[model samples]
Target: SMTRRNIVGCRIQHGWKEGNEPVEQWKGTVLEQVSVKPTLYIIKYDGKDSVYGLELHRDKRVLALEILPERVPTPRIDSRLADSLIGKAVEHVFESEEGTKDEWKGMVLARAPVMDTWFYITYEKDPVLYMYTLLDDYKDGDLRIIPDSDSLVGKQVEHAKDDGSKRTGIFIHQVVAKPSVYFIKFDDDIHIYVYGLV
Candidate 1:
């Protein structure tokens, strides 16, 4: 089962070293991006006080921060389904047209673009469509799933839409539900509002 997790605020900052860097710090949810229009987000930052929400925007630079509660548990993958997903593996076949070479082979963590979304996948071959099973990321936002490639074949999996897909929408309930990739759309300045494991 999943439980409610704490939402925190954060400050923004920036840095550059070995390469040309732009922007300072980001004060938003680590999993999903938030828009400055609404100005509501969950994040943690590095500063004196770990404030939970500090009114963010596209070009804001953070200096210091603080967490109101001072302590928060890391995300976690709940039981009931987690046990099953971790125990299973799936297989997939990706084509080069997808940019991921067909010969390329490896496991990937697939989930809805929203954070705290309970569903996860172990795409055997590719991360786009096809999931071995639907697993939960738990209440803490901790997602757990192992990829074995062989056992995941034929299992029903909800697929995340590619970036080019025409669909667009924003997920509200993070840990329980999320918007599909087809529904994820953003302008260049708004891209910062979108956060995902992807």
Candidate 2:
């Protein structure tokens, strides 16, 4: 029931409000287009014909400029397994010792132009400005979407390593912001990338 949505032909918006006074008329408040590399966004200046490619790093302002529900939710009608991930709630995992097995609650901002499964995402607890989801994990459940309250916490999820060794862990807590973490207590917490549990 998931579809890989395309990020092109979408409208983007910036602001010129009192506090959000970064995107002024001189630069442009509305823009358009989504490219592959590093999630590039093409924008038009001052509503003019000139278009510029925005490298839009882990910068939230640029990503927040999305004018609509991320993108049209309609399925691409292609031979993909899932639907558009845009706007869906997710838990981004980490790879560092600072809670490497933990996750951050966030949403999918857009799809990266690279590997079909790679997605560009932003966090509600933005410990990191922006992060990429190896959505491949989702296909098999090494990664997963955030469910309703306490739905995933404490559940005994299972995983297998690339070496075929299996393991299990208790998903203790999901950090809403930084310094906290989705504590899945496990030994050798190897991600099996296979969906087995609820």
Candidate 3:
């Protein structure tokens, strides 16, 4: 019993039982999913790792959460989120003079220069097409893992302009709480689009 493909920081349990020696004491998260071939997982050990990445291929990368009991929720960030947390979703509350508003979703695109907890979140404001804001580590509740029905996590989308430039890329995640904004990774760089045409 093994998992198909779970989230990035998901907890995976012990042992890769082929040629590599199984350290039953080893526990970790899905460090990085291999795009090189059959799509393996690099186990980022929770313990003091001898190395950051464990060399593994598709069949060799089996997770024990499949053999053991399952856990509640998703993508629990136990340690530092680091670069692996890019494109993840977080949220903040927005208020005007009225002072009553719901959670405004945040798309974590980058980490600011100095702060450990601060992340560059993208937002949608009417004054302009889009706005980028820096939010400090707003605490635990602000970090959220969204369900795919409302998320653009794996959508294949394209952008075409009248200038005759057409490029298509993968939809990493929706940046904000609306249908108007999203950034896709292209060959050039990350490009965002806001179309109410939803």
Candidate 4:
């Protein structure tokens, strides 16, 4: 009964299997439909893209799938508006003793090239400056978009490690546009791209 119901841009997760195997629970955005026989779909999660094939579910009692609310369309970028952030306040997260922390009280000193759906920010913190990436929320008087890093700074966040043991670290620094990437203590590190921070 799940014919192509305009599923593009919708989020979904795979259901459990017959043997109680772990399910693919991470949310994915339906990019496209590949087939109808097996209910095939191409989804993108985090930054990776892949295809998935759903079975008829050897069971008839329970549903073997879950779909979530569709993704909302982000506002288009305005280069002029982005340049205006040069003197506004901003924040970004970083590693800390507790778990993950943030330097919330910072000033946006510059702007990077405007991306399709992201805000590039250069934050000034007295002696040092950092680059960050943020979502493009086009609205006036919306301070809630700025995170209060105190509540969730030192939580365990996942990252890649040298040994590949599911690198776990305090939810520290973040580069919104660039996943699994960061540069520390380098002011002129133009090669790295970050937009918004905690």
Model 2 TM-score, all chains together: 0.30
Ranking by TM-score: 2, 3, 4, 1
Q: Name the runs in model 3 displaced over 4 angstroms.
A: 1-116, 123-150, 174-182, 190-198
- Pairs that collide in candidate 2 are 2-82, 2-83, 3-82, 3-83, 140-194, 140-195, 160-192
Residue-level lDDT for 161 in candidate 2: 77
Model 3: per-residue Cα lDDT over 9-105, one tens digit each: 4555655464466645455555344343224333435543221233333334444544224442332233454554555555555445575556656
Candidate 2: where are CA atoms >4 Å away?
A: 1-79, 82-84, 96-101, 113-117, 127-133, 148-198
Write one digit per residue (lDDT tens) for candidate 4, span 1-198: 776656555666554333466544455555444232224333444443122222223333224456676554445656676655544565444437886455545544444222134333444443233333343332433222343332223344455557845633232233333333232211122122232443
Model 1 TM-score is: 0.23
Could you give candidate 2's per-residue lDDT for residues 127-147 as a string of tens digits?
A: 222323344567656556766
The residue-level lDDT of candidate 1 at 16 comes to: 17
Over 4 Å off in model 4, which ranges? 1-4, 16-21, 35-39, 47-63, 78-198
Which should have the higher lDDT, number 3 or number 4?
Answer: 3
* lDDT for model 1: 0.32
lDDT of each: 0.32, 0.43, 0.43, 0.40
Query: Highest TM-score: which candidate?
Result: 2
- Candidate 2 weakest ten by summed lDDT: 189-198
| TM-score quality measure for candidate 4 | 0.27
Q: What is the lDDT of residue 101 in candidate 1?
A: 42
Q: Which ten-residue region of model 4 has the weakest summed lDDT?
A: 183-192
CA RMSD for every model?
Answer: 17.9, 18.4, 14.4, 14.3
Identify the superior model by TM-score, candidate 1 or candidate 2: 2
How does model 2 fare in lDDT? 0.43
